[PDB]
Amino acid sequence: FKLPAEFITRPHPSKDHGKECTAYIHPNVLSSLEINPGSFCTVGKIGENGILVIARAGDEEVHPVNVITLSTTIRSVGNLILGDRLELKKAQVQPPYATKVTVGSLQGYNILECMEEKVIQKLLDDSGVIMPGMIFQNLKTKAGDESIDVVITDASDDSLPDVSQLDLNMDDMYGGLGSTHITFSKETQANRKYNLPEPLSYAAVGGLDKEIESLKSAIEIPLHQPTLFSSFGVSPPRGILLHGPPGTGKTMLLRVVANTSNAHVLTINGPSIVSKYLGETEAALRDIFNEARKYQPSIIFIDEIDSIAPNRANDDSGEVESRVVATLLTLMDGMGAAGKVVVIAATNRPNSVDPALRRPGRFDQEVEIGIPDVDARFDILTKQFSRMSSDRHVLDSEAIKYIASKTHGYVGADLTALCRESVMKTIQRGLGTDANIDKFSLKVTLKDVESAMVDIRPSAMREIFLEMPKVYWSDIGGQEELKTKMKEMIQLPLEASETFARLGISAPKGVLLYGPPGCSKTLTAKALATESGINFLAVKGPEIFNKYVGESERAIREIFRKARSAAPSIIFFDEIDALSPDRDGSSTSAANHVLTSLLNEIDGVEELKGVVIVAATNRPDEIDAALLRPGRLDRHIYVGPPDVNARLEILKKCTKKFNTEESGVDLHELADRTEGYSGAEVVLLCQEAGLAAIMEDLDVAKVELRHFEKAFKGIARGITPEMLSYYEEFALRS
Amino acid sequence: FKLPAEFITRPHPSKDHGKETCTAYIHPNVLSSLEINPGSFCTVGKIGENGILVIARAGDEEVHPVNVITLSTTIRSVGNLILGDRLELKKAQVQPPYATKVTVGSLQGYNILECMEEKVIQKLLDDSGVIMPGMIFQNLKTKAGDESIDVVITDASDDSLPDVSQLDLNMDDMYGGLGSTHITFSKETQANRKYNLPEPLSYAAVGGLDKEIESLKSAIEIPLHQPTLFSSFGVSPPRGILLHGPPGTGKTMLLRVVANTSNAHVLTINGPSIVSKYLGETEAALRDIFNEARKYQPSIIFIDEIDSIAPNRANDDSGEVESRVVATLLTLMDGMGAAGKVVVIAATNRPNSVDPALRRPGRFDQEVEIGIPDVDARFDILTKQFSRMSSDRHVLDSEAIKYIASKTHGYVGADLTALCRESVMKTIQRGLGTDANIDKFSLKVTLKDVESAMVDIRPSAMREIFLEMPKVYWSDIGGQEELKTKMKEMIQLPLEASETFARLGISAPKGVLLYGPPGCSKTLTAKALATESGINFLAVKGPEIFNKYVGESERAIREIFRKARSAAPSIIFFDEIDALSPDRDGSSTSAANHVLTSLLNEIDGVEELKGVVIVAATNRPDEIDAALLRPGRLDRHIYVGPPDVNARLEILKKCTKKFNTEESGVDLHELADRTEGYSGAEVVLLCQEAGLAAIMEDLDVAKVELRHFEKAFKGIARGITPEMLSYYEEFALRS
Numbered sequence A: 001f002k003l004p005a006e007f008i009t010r011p012h013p014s015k016d017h018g019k020e021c022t023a024y025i026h027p028n029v030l031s032s033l034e035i036n037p038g039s040f041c042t043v044g045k046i047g048e049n050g051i052l053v054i055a056r057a058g059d060e061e062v063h064p065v066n067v068i069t070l071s072t073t074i075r076s077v078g079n080l081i082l083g084d085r086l087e088l089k090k091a092q093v094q095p096p097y098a099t100k101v102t103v104g105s106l107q108g109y110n111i112l113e114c115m116e117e118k119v120i121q122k123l124l125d126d127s128g129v130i131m132p133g134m135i136f137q138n139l140k141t142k143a144g145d146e147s148i149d150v151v152i153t154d155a156s157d158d159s160l161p162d163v164s165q166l167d168l169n170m171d172d173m174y175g176g177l178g179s180t181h182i183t184f185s186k187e188t189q190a191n192r193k194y195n196l197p198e199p200l201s202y203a204a205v206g207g208l209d210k211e212i213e214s215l216k217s218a219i220e221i222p223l224h225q226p227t228l229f230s231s232f233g234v235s236p237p238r239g240i241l242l243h244g245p246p247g248t249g250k251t252m253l254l255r256v257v258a259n260t261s262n263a264h265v266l267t268i269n270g271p272s273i274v275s276k277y278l279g280e281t282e283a284a285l286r287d288i289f290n291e292a293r294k295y296q297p298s299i300i301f302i303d304e305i306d307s308i309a310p311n312r313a314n315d316d317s318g319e320v321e322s323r324v325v326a327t328l329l330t331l332m333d334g335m336g337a338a339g340k341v342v343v344i345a346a347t348n349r350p351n352s353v354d355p356a357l358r359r360p361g362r363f364d365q366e367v368e369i370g371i372p373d374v375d376a377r378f379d380i381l382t383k384q385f386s387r388m389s390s391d392r393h394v395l396d397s398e399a400i401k402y403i404a405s406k407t408h409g410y411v412g413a414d415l416t417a418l419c420r421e422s423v424m425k426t427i428q429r430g431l432g433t434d435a436n437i438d439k440f441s442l443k444v445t446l447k448d449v450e451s452a453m454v455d456i457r458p459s460a461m462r463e464i465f466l467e468m469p470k471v472y473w474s475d476i477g478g479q480e481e482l483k484t485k486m487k488e489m490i491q492l493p494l495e496a497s498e499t500f501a502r503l504g505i506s507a508p509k510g511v512l513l514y515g516p517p518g519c520s521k522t523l524t525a526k527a528l529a530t531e532s533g534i535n536f537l538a539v540k541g542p543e544i545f546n547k548y549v550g551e552s553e554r555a556i557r558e559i560f561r562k563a564r565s566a567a568p569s570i571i572f573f574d575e576i577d578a579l580s581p582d583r584d585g586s587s588t589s590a591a592n593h594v595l596t597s598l599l600n601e602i603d604g605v606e607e608l609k610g611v612v613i614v615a616a617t618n619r620p621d622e623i624d625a626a627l628l629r630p631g632r633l634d635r636h637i638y639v640g641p642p643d644v645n646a647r648l649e650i651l652k653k654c655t656k657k658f659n660t661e662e663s664g665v666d667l668h669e670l671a672d673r674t675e676g677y678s679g680a681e682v683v684l685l686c687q688e689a690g691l692a693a694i695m696e697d698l699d700v701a702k703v704e705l706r707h708f709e710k711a712f713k714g715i716a717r718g719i720t721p722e723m724l725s726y727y728e729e730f731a732l733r734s
Numbered sequence B: 001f002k003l004p005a006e007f008i009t010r011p012h013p014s015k016d017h018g019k020e021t022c023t024a025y026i027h028p029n030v031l032s033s034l035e036i037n038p039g040s041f042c043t044v045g046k047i048g049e050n051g052i053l054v055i056a057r058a059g060d061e062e063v064h065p066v067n068v069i070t071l072s073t074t075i076r077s078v079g080n081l082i083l084g085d086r087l088e089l090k091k092a093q094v095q096p097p098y099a100t101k102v103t104v105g106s107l108q109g110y111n112i113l114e115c116m117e118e119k120v121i122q123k124l125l126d127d128s129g130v131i132m133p134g135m136i137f138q139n140l141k142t143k144a145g146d147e148s149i150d151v152v153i154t155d156a157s158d159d160s161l162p163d164v165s166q167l168d169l170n171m172d173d174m175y176g177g178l179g180s181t182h183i184t185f186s187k188e189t190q191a192n193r194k195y196n197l198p199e200p201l202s203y204a205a206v207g208g209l210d211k212e213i214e215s216l217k218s219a220i221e222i223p224l225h226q227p228t229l230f231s232s233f234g235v236s237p238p239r240g241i242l243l244h245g246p247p248g249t250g251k252t253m254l255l256r257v258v259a260n261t262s263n264a265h266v267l268t269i270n271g272p273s274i275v276s277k278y279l280g281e282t283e284a285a286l287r288d289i290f291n292e293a294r295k296y297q298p299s300i301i302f303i304d305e306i307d308s309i310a311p312n313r314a315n316d317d318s319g320e321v322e323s324r325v326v327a328t329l330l331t332l333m334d335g336m337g338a339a340g341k342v343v344v345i346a347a348t349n350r351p352n353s354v355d356p357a358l359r360r361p362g363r364f365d366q367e368v369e370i371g372i373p374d375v376d377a378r379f380d381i382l383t384k385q386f387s388r389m390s391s392d393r394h395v396l397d398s399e400a401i402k403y404i405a406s407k408t409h410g411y412v413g414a415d416l417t418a419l420c421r422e423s424v425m426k427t428i429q430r431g432l433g434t435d436a437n438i439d440k441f442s443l444k445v446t447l448k449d450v451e452s453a454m455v456d457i458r459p460s461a462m463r464e465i466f467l468e469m470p471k472v473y474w475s476d477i478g479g480q481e482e483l484k485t486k487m488k489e490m491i492q493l494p495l496e497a498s499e500t501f502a503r504l505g506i507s508a509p510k511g512v513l514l515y516g517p518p519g520c521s522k523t524l525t526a527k528a529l530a531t532e533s534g535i536n537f538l539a540v541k542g543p544e545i546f547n548k549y550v551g552e553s554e555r556a557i558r559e560i561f562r563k564a565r566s567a568a569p570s571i572i573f574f575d576e577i578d579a580l581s582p583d584r585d586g587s588s589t590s591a592a593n594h595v596l597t598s599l600l601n602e603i604d605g606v607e608e609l610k611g612v613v614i615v616a617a618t619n620r621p622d623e624i625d626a627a628l629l630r631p632g633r634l635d636r637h638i639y640v641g642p643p644d645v646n647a648r649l650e651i652l653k654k655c656t657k658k659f660n661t662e663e664s665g666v667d668l669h670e671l672a673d674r675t676e677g678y679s680g681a682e683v684v685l686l687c688q689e690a691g692l693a694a695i696m697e698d699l700d701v702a703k704v705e706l707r708h709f710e711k712a713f714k715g716i717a718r719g720i721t722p723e724m725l726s727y728y729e730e731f732a733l734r735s
């Protein structure tokens, strides 16, 4: 009458060897399945088309019905999660026979021979020899200690029913305390014809480091050393929040911490727990939390927190609402005194979630994962080539650097899709052209990867912070004094915060950039961000503007919080002369409110010493008098049009592709003639000259002086001395 | 106590001979439960379409599971039994009376099989349970001449008392070793239409979409026929195929086409029919269906109308069935096996209708888009449909087909079938009304009925964002070669200079501006570029993009830009920029300013679009903000002023082609010289009104006189003033 429907796994205690197929099952469950205890058992493991045949035994009536024993060896073989949902069914037909069985000798160079001493008997002592191959701990093997394990992936036995997946094998050996035609062979990875499930490993995870070690420490302190942390009495945290842009790495991290942990875990299925009646949901959450704190080793996983816990202030949806948030808060407030419980919550956007009450008291650990930079993307591509192995492709390292540099706005989720699409379109190209040629010779090249990155069309370009392409000082066309000025401005806070703490002077934290719209106002920010090596946030003027009232204020507050969380860094605004005006040009009250809020955040009733505020403007009249006050944005840079040296450097950089000797230009007369232009204007004139050189006979190895003269006469400067005089007058009065 | 309810099909293995028509591998327990003699005929009704296709039954060797049955690939293909359908078995019927004629058909062949025949009659009619509605047999080996030959046995002249049986199985009585009823070799046509049996759909049924069908083929039978090919890489084979497009195109038609052309196991669903009041019941049903599908290694699952069961989840919510089913589907499709050989096919109406969460590049990277057909595809589909009706039903020449294709602009395959049906019914009605029940073959298909058909069809696809602008040849193009050379160079530089630009780094200007008089040379320029370019053209009108809802134009232009980017290097055109441009002067709403900022950031902000080329044609250029009027974007400027004497003369001689020049007596030069201040549209209007003035005298005229031309010329005025031309010249000089 018990009617058991759901089952969960549990580690086998006391270690040792035992059955090595324990299957401690309550006698009531034994009678419920209408199968004698002296027979095999099957685990449904809900889905995945995975059925296992394993010998079954009985428990001592103390073992609870809810949890079952399956042995860590079988759990590792079948990738059974320590906490996944399981079922029970009737046993299937016995396997026919086993033929070869061969050791694998993973995570090592193999070549043991002498210290082997008939491992076959110990490996096959258990009746549960399986096709995927059992995994055993080192235990004790003569001298040398160390850890060695072998797997039985490869064999030559076939079973008629294709429904059965693990298709266990039996043993029949002669000995005390020789298989069939030897068994020791192979030293490579697992068999690929059977394609054993190998989802992840720590060797694979390398994209993020500064976050992965931080979160590893955060999750290991409450569990591995609970008494040491609880001795102080500050209580152990029970909440970890993971957030980031879509496509980043959070699901791999939760899967890794689930797989690498031999302790019990609790993973929910998402919004499926929501039912028509709230009573069923309440009972389910009560039961899962009871299972959680009943056993000391337990980890709780929550995914899609926003869907489970919608914001209360955003909308009054009803039904599933903040009541479940309150009941879970009461649950995690008092599970025990010290305990060992860690909860991982990964959400796409904390804004959708309600952080109004979460941040103050229930948790104080922040985990932020951003889009990979050049180094992280390069590392991910390198690891991709690593587990792809060179037996299937060849590509040089500088090609890897080129691909990493080209891929800037891509997300971590995009690279695997790029690899898969490259593989499929390369093989379809081979089928179309070479007419079913061997795939080994075709392998992977560079042109297919280039086509894939051209035609992928990523959708992750839209984001709150713009990661501008990295440029070095070579691309900067300017003067040495300006470079020294920005070097001083970016070096004073980071290298003098400790000095200012004792001095009590801090820094102005304000830089204003005004000048011609030609150049030296946007690319210089990228160059300084690249050279400093600090986090850089770039947002445009109209980009933050929104039709809804207060959306711009919310975005500004969010970016300010991100800058605060991202350590002392520099924040830059691309275009300020559209939001700055309040009286010169007509505007709505939202602009005035935003201006007041940003002024208060900069220099009102609080001081943001860590961050540095730098802004660029095109017309100085739009800046309000309140913002244009001493103590805020006091520093001003003329940053006028590039001089002869800067224009000459830009021309030399742009002429690198062409041949200067063949052209015959001295690179000085052109610079002298081109005196009233700007860096962007110089680039446009160079492009026009190249076009005028290439319409003659398509590709050209050099550009003639006639093309340069035609380009120069075709395009006008478009700049008047009146604006320069106005800028000089503004500079003089300031 | 087994209580069998449902059965499914599976191809007969081991080849051999066996029964080859009446295998019927069913467990003896099922036969005993039905109280039916195993040595007798079996009747499986497959739910619906009565006739039950009576077939003789036999027994298995106790290794055939009850849930699956066999009825031979020949009968499966003839009776439209797709591999993986629903089969329902019931009690046997009465014995067949007799077979009378049976006649071969020689499908997909020229017949004349007497040389390699070698008594085909024995090999066909010796097998038990031969049924008239069709036998298909593999070539095997018939002496020399190899190749493959097949026959059609559908036609017969036998009548059965019960009309319910549409398959009317008949017995056989042969006399030979290793003679019919008065020979059997006759005719060369297709199966008789009076049987009205369903016919399989092949790749000849589809046309005009060769690249899309070839790509989706390659993509669908690279996994299935070569699982080891994808297993070798180890990066797992993708299982995401998305069918999205306007309704009535035929992606679902092609879905059943590729289902029929593949002999592997397939599955079909009704969509929201699985949804029930119990979530657990639906989960159990779907998991059981998926387990049955994955029980056999070769299997295909088809999903149709996914938006109902896959909410976007980006906005609002609902209840009962929600994104939980999407999550469980994702979990089950992420873990059937590392390599596997089972793919998932999904069909949807709108790209945003399907769940964006379901759209993951890791698993759903392949997407195929089926747009509305162009003139070439419309001509191809009309031609193949006309060949399907064949020359006996109608006699239509290629000129009529191309005229109909040119006339049809927004029509789709569903519209084509609708107009075909409308023409048929209009012809029937006209014949009944006038000829008083005359023979229907004599009236056949004409032009008047089809004309009334697309006059009265009223298609519902007129309102759309994707417009296939009609193309015109270079003969109708009237202008000067000065602008023609410039536009040709601009549209030819990227296509054969992309690599040169990539090496040099210059890339492309990507900016073209066309400002001129409102008369002509804008729509004509768009037609000429769309014709000569040979690349997909997207036409967006000025007032069309404007909508009452705030932000409609925002993601409208976002979607059109995404489509242009993802549709290979192409060209994008905007009809009227002078309406969206005015913000400060026109005191437009904030939506227009937001759209302008968005497009300005899209064209040349924080990204580069080298593949696509932007061409802009506007009437009033003073409303464009100075931010857009910047070097590096839309820098190229074309005067494209009023047509000169040459273009006007060409237009006049084109319009005079309908009339007779010799009878008129005009030299085609004095009229052009007199009409100098007009424009192409003005010249066309003048020609039309001159023709009208010539025809109100005595109705139809074979020529137009000079007096009528003078009357038309002096009746109206050019309407063009020198001050606007001077202002345009001043703007050109200052820009």
Ligand SMILES: Nc1ncnc2c1ncn2[C@@H]1O[C@H](COP(=O)(O)OP(=O)(O)OP(=O)(O)O)[C@@H](O)[C@H]1O
Residues within 6 Å of the ligand: A206, A207, A208, A245, A246, A247, A248, A249, A250, A251, A252, A253, A346, A347, A348, A380, A412, A413, A414, A415, A416, A417, B362
């Ligand atoms: N560091 C990485 N290296 C390689 N591939 C990665 C990496 N990070 C993410 N991916 C790719 O992105 C896919 C999805 O990533 P993942 O599921 O971890 O993202 P998530 O942000 O947690 O998910 P969601 O979008 O549901 O919030 C992975 O299956 C993999 O293909």
Ligand SMILES: Nc1ncnc2c1ncn2[C@@H]1O[C@H](COP(=O)(O)OP(=O)(O)OP(=O)(O)O)[C@@H](O)[C@H]1O
Residues within 6 Å of the ligand: B205, B206, B207, B245, B246, B247, B248, B249, B250, B251, B252, B253, B254, B347, B349, B413, B414, B417
């Ligand atoms: N390539 C084609 N070959 C033959 N018939 C076609 C073709 N394309 C469309 N049709 C015709 O279109 C008609 C209706 O097509 P249907 O509405 O099923 O198109 P679909 O785009 O696949 O469907 P939907 O978008 O509604 O799911 C049918 O009569 C069919 O014969």
